[PDB]
Design a protein around this motif. Structure first.
Motif, short mmCIF file in Angstrom:
data_model
loop_
_atom_site.label_atom_id
_atom_site.label_comp_id
_atom_site.label_asym_id
_atom_site.label_seq_id
_atom_site.Cartn_x
_atom_site.Cartn_y
_atom_site.Cartn_z
N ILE A 1 0.83 -1.20 0.00
CA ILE A 1 0.00 0.00 0.00
C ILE A 1 0.87 1.25 0.00
O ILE A 1 0.52 2.27 -0.60
CB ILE A 1 -0.97 -0.02 1.20
CG1 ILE A 1 -1.93 -1.20 1.08
CG2 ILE A 1 -1.74 1.29 1.27
CD1 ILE A 1 -2.74 -1.46 2.33
N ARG B 1 0.66 4.19 -2.73
CA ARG B 1 0.46 5.59 -2.36
C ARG B 1 1.59 6.46 -2.91
O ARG B 1 1.34 7.58 -3.39
CB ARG B 1 0.35 5.72 -0.84
CG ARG B 1 0.06 7.12 -0.33
CD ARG B 1 -0.09 7.14 1.18
NE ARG B 1 1.14 6.77 1.88
CZ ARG B 1 2.13 7.61 2.14
NH1 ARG B 1 2.07 8.89 1.80
NH2 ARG B 1 3.21 7.16 2.78
N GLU C 1 0.85 6.90 -6.59
CA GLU C 1 -0.34 7.64 -6.95
C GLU C 1 -0.37 9.07 -6.41
O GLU C 1 -1.25 9.84 -6.81
CB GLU C 1 -1.59 6.89 -6.47
CG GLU C 1 -1.81 5.57 -7.18
CD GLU C 1 -2.14 5.76 -8.65
OE1 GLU C 1 -2.77 6.79 -8.99
OE2 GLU C 1 -1.75 4.90 -9.47
N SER D 1 -5.37 3.33 -7.94
CA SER D 1 -6.24 3.80 -6.87
C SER D 1 -7.63 3.19 -6.99
O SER D 1 -8.23 2.79 -5.98
CB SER D 1 -6.33 5.33 -6.90
OG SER D 1 -7.38 5.79 -6.06
N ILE E 1 -7.48 -0.41 -5.80
CA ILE E 1 -7.41 -0.50 -4.34
C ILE E 1 -8.77 -0.20 -3.73
O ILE E 1 -9.19 -0.85 -2.75
CB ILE E 1 -6.32 0.45 -3.80
CG1 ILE E 1 -4.96 0.13 -4.41
CG2 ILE E 1 -6.25 0.36 -2.28
CD1 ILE E 1 -4.28 -1.07 -3.81
N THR E 2 -9.48 0.79 -4.28
CA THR E 2 -10.83 1.06 -3.82
C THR E 2 -11.74 -0.15 -4.04
O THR E 2 -12.59 -0.46 -3.20
CB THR E 2 -11.40 2.28 -4.54
OG1 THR E 2 -10.68 3.45 -4.14
CG2 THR E 2 -12.87 2.46 -4.22
N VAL F 1 -10.99 -2.66 -1.23
CA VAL F 1 -11.59 -2.32 0.07
C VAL F 1 -13.10 -2.49 0.01
O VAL F 1 -13.73 -2.95 0.98
CB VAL F 1 -11.18 -0.90 0.51
CG1 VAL F 1 -11.85 0.16 -0.34
CG2 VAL F 1 -11.50 -0.69 1.98
N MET G 1 -8.87 -6.22 8.75
CA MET G 1 -8.15 -5.84 7.53
C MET G 1 -8.88 -4.80 6.70
O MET G 1 -8.23 -4.01 6.02
CB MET G 1 -7.80 -7.06 6.69
CG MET G 1 -6.67 -6.75 5.69
SD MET G 1 -4.98 -6.86 6.32
CE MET G 1 -4.81 -8.60 6.58
N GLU G 2 -10.21 -4.75 6.74
CA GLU G 2 -10.89 -3.64 6.09
C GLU G 2 -10.41 -2.32 6.67
O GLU G 2 -10.05 -1.39 5.93
CB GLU G 2 -12.40 -3.79 6.24
CG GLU G 2 -13.19 -2.68 5.60
CD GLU G 2 -14.59 -2.59 6.17
OE1 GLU G 2 -15.17 -3.65 6.49
OE2 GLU G 2 -15.10 -1.46 6.32
N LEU H 1 -7.63 -1.75 8.34
CA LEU H 1 -6.21 -1.54 8.06
C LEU H 1 -6.01 -0.99 6.66
O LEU H 1 -5.28 -0.01 6.47
CB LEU H 1 -5.43 -2.85 8.24
CG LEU H 1 -3.96 -2.81 7.81
CD1 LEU H 1 -3.18 -3.84 8.59
CD2 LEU H 1 -3.79 -3.05 6.31
N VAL H 2 -6.63 -1.62 5.66
CA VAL H 2 -6.46 -1.17 4.28
C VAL H 2 -6.96 0.26 4.13
O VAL H 2 -6.29 1.12 3.54
CB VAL H 2 -7.17 -2.12 3.31
CG1 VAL H 2 -7.21 -1.52 1.91
CG2 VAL H 2 -6.47 -3.47 3.29
N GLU H 3 -8.15 0.54 4.67
CA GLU H 3 -8.71 1.88 4.54
C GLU H 3 -7.79 2.92 5.16
O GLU H 3 -7.48 3.94 4.54
CB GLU H 3 -10.10 1.93 5.18
CG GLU H 3 -11.00 3.02 4.62
CD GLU H 3 -10.63 4.41 5.10
OE1 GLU H 3 -10.17 4.53 6.26
OE2 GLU H 3 -10.81 5.37 4.33
N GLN I 1 -4.54 2.74 5.90
CA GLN I 1 -3.22 2.84 5.28
C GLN I 1 -3.29 3.52 3.92
O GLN I 1 -2.35 4.24 3.55
CB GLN I 1 -2.60 1.45 5.14
CG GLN I 1 -2.15 0.84 6.46
CD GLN I 1 -0.96 1.56 7.06
OE1 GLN I 1 0.17 1.39 6.61
NE2 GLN I 1 -1.21 2.35 8.10
N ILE J 1 -4.85 7.93 -1.05
CA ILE J 1 -5.22 7.57 -2.41
C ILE J 1 -6.65 7.04 -2.47
O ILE J 1 -7.38 7.28 -3.44
CB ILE J 1 -4.22 6.55 -2.99
CG1 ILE J 1 -4.28 5.23 -2.22
CG2 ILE J 1 -2.82 7.13 -2.95
CD1 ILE J 1 -3.32 4.18 -2.73
N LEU J 2 -7.07 6.31 -1.44
CA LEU J 2 -8.36 5.63 -1.48
C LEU J 2 -9.48 6.64 -1.74
O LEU J 2 -9.55 7.69 -1.10
CB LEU J 2 -8.61 4.90 -0.16
CG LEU J 2 -9.58 3.72 -0.19
CD1 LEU J 2 -9.17 2.70 -1.24
CD2 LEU J 2 -9.65 3.07 1.18
N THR J 3 -10.35 6.30 -2.69
CA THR J 3 -11.43 7.18 -3.09
C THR J 3 -12.76 6.70 -2.53
O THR J 3 -13.78 7.38 -2.65
CB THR J 3 -11.53 7.27 -4.63
OG1 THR J 3 -11.84 5.98 -5.17
CG2 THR J 3 -10.22 7.77 -5.22
#
Lengths: 32, 168, 65, 94
Positions: B159, B163, B166, C58, C61-62, C65, D81-82, D84-86, D88, D92-94
């Motif tokens: 990750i 990051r 990106e 990105s 990865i979204t 999740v 882990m949900e 953790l991923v969110e 971390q 970038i996460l949208t």
């Protein structure tokens, strides 16, 4: 004159906060 | 060290500096030991017995030459070094025991006595009770007690890669 | 956390425990898809909501999740 | 009855359980696999029957409760882990 440099303090705040994030979101929306 | 010139130096200086080095070694502050040792002039470190014995003792400890470390107990260029050397010997007994723990899939007793530098089976038994051993059921101290993907850490690293890619 | 459409198809359930067979609803994989013109229209409608400056990585990865 | 990890059956164990001999447990296991009640393989050199699936069996209320606890553990791991991923990838996460 030195409290006029306090005017320069508020000038510094104006550059820093107002314009930086302005350009940041401006270029984000420009990419969009 | 401060008042160079205006002073004629004391013959006891090198002896007492070596004693300080022994103290630092006994307390196991190796960084400070080396830092102060760097203060001693070159030829003083290389020739003077009082500064050679401490440095040589550290050299032997780092190498693992515990035999020569023990023989330092007889060397003792100045008798006052005994106090700071006894505690170092006890700590070295602990370190040697740790070496024995990790190595020596199996070890006996009659020779383990010399290995640990002890001179009495009662001391051997007391020390084994210390920490804990199997006592040698066949006269052999068999302390041979010797997956799990770091998925979380690896996912964090990946990750981080994403990051860093990106935020372009 | 899910699609708005749940698709079912009626099917006779021949129970192995001898209970009488009865008509029951059976799920079928449903998803949303668009014609070319439908996609054009919906993209125009979402012109200002949908975010496209995300990047493939990105977006994936979204999706994870 | 055996768990999902140590589900390796030895010829001696199966022979004791079924009152057969180690020379017939092998044929019994192959018959089981053929009829399809279990899935797995046989290593006769070590006389171990590796198993990976058995016919679904009726469960009692206590067994359902235990399965529920296992499901709770699984759900906690998934949520962990949900989160953790969110956290971390929040940037970038949208």
């Amino acid at each position: 004159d030195l409290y006029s440099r306090y005017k320069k303090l508020q000038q510094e705040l104006e550059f820093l906060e107002v314009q930086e994030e302005y350009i940041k979101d401006e270029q984000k929306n420009l990419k969009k | 060290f401060d008042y160079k010139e205006q002073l004629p130096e004391s013959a006891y200086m090198h002896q007492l500096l070596g004693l300080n080095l022994l103290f630092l070694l006994s307390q196991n502050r190796v960084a400070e030991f080396h830092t102060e040792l760097e203060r001693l002039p070159a030829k003083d470190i290389q020739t003077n017995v009082y500064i050679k014995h401490p440095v040589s003792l550290e050299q032997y400890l780092m190498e693992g030459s515990y035999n020569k470390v023990f023989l330092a107990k007889g060397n003792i260029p100045a008798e006052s070094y005994t106090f700071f050397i006894d505690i170092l010997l006890d700590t070295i007994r602990d370190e040697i025991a740790g070496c024995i723990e990790k190595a020596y899939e199996k070890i006996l007793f009659t020779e383990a006595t010399r290995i640990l530098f002890f001179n009495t089976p009662k001391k051997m038994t007391d020390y084994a009770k210390k920490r804990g051993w199997v006592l040698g059921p066949n006269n052999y101290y068999s302390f041979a007690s010797q997956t799990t993907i770091p998925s979380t850490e690896l996912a964090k690293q990946v990750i981080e890669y994403a990051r860093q890619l990106e935020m372009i | 956390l899910g699609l708005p459409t749940e698709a079912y198809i009626s099917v006779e359930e021949v129970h192995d425990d001898g209970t009488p067979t009865s008509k029951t609803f059976e799920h079928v994989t449903s998803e949303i898809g668009a014609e070319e013109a439908e996609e054009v229209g919906v993209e125009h409608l979402l012109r200002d909501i949908k975010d496209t400056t995300v990047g493939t990585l990105s977006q994936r990865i979204t999706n994870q999740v | 009855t055996r768990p999902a990890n140590h589900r390796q059956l030895t010829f001696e164990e199966i022979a004791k359980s079924a009152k057969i001999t180690v020379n017939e447990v092998e044929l019994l296991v192959m018959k089981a696999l053929s009829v399809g009640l279990v899935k797995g393989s046989i290593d006769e050199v070590d006389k171990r029957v590796h198993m990976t699936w058995v016919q679904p069996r009726v469960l009692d209320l206590q067994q359902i409760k235990g399965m529920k606890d296992r499901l709770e553990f699984w759900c906690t791991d998934v949520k962990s882990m949900e989160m953790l991923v969110e956290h971390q990838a929040h940037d970038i996460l949208t």
